[model samples]
Target chain A: DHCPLGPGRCCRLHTVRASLEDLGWADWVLSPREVQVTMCIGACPSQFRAANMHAQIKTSLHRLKPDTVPAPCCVPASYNPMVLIQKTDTGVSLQTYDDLLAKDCHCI
Target chain B: DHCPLGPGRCCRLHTVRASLEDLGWADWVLSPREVQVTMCIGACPSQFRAANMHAQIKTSLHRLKPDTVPAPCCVPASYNPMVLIQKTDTGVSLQTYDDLLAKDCHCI
Candidate 1:
């Protein structure tokens, strides 16, 4: 998306269909062919990316020592769970995967 | 101080000093020189931004029309008030300014 009239660059979740057939899990999954998967994307400003003392220092150090220290980048901060309907030996069943869904995004 | 490993980006409130002297409000106010102002900062990964429909459609539009559609940005979602010691005609007093401190950060 375009930033109209404000600070540019950001980080957020981008959701898309997880195609079981494309993932080669179609044989194992019995429900719908598509599953929703939320992922993180975007850029982060160094100053705004620091949330705690640790991150703050990291930002400063990275600026001072760009060669070894890495610049902070956008990433996932929290997560949710997801379940997939699957075909198992015991007929159709559901499987749960914790930390599969990105719940929140942030700068470290 | 560093993102030891794994996801490194995040968003949150950062607490800092709001100096009346620096702000040039010292002459009009009374009390200590420093005031704590917690402001919002950080990047937002869209999918983890929220589990709301308002964001989902915007995500779609943004990717489709990056030039006009804006990507969701991390911003202050809630706020707290700050009490400023003031000097008025009646003498020294206290004043409150709402929405001065950002309490929560979210994607918008």
Candidate 2:
């Protein structure tokens, strides 16, 4: 089972680190790579910051149907790029990923 | 008054070109500058693509109180960087801005 955020909390941004060396996957990775990735947390409250009309209606629904509709949660809305330099069998090269880090978070 | 999108349509992504020449701001802007920007359109339908439980509740509220809690609309969720070469008192230089072009749209 997984532990979840408090249902009464507001949807917001959370984060964790992903490390190749920590995961024991640095054998061929060559360089030390640690990425700080973002995760969404919290839950919808009756009234919160930037709580638009849509979110307002949903929060009202949560007060009624705690099972059917439950509550809306936060999620990643934007991401940042990530790059790393590593060594290979032949040579070393820099690799990049378009969206490797979360730059913005929003409630969905 | 501005003409907005129809109220019954589903929210989606839309785009337009931002041209300095067309706007008559090219005198000191140097080279031609035309960037494609994005805009969100349409109203929130009951069931649409990527419509979550929150949007679901809001859509229902629209049926009851059209003026108070209208249906949720679409908006940019992600954006792409924009780079342009512009002339200045010194010389021409490349300028870049993050979140200049919308890359993704979502109901909110």
Candidate 3:
């Protein structure tokens, strides 16, 4: 008898597909496996990582001057800044976790 | 059983329809019955009427343009000449044909 991961198998190792439109570019490229591992794990864990990344960046920016930065503007700008921020946060968060997991394995 | 003339019946006494777009204007106005009959008719007979009208109009224009006349220019200019030429040609053509047709029957 064989055991399977059930419906989880479909999502378990699923690739995060993106389009040119998503990246605002003319092509698509996949993030590395290690990066995907950190980015595509459980939904709650990913959300936590995202929030933490945002806080970290905001903290650095705030050290300079937090009050000078206006609250999130809903108005459409000629160009968007939030998209770049989101992409960078995801990549940075994944890098941080990958480094941590490596350190834990090395301690053993 | 009722007698029928088939598709010929539909085309025979059918009302010719024109739209604003077809008229090259923003609105459609029904041509008077006197006008419509002259304009829309059987293919071979109508085309003959058209050719005759073109010859007549060209004759008049030629009579006017003596020493300074120029040939038709096909290249796109600041404006198009053929559109106005075609429109006047069609209207004037239909009027002449209609008048001749009426005069023939009236002579009886």
Best by lDDT: 1
Best by DockQ: 1
Name model 1 segments beyond 4 Å from true. A1-108, B1-8
Worst 10 residues of 1 chain B by lDDT: B1-10
State the C-alpha lDDT per candidate: 0.56, 0.51, 0.20
Per-residue lDDT over A4-93 for candidate 2, one digit per residue giving the tens place of the 0 to 100 score: 444434555545554665334476555547755444445545554433333343444446545533244455556667676777888987
Kindly list the per-residue Cα lDDT of model 3 for residues B34-100, writing each as its tens digit.
Answer: 2211111111211122222222222232234433211111110011111111234235322211111
Question: Lowest-scoring 10 consecutive residues by lDDT in candidate 3 chain B?
Answer: B99-108
- For every prediction, compared with the true complex, DockQ reads 0.04, 0.02, 0.00
**Cα shift from native, residue A45, model 1 (Å):** 19
Model 2, span B1-108: residue lDDT tens: 112445334555555454655434466555446644454445545555434433443445455546534345555556666566777787787777565555665654
DockQ of 3: 0.00
TM-scores of the candidates are 0.44, 0.40, 0.13
lDDT of 3 by residue, A15-107 (tens): 223333332323322333122111111111111222222222222333344342111111100111111112343453222111111111000
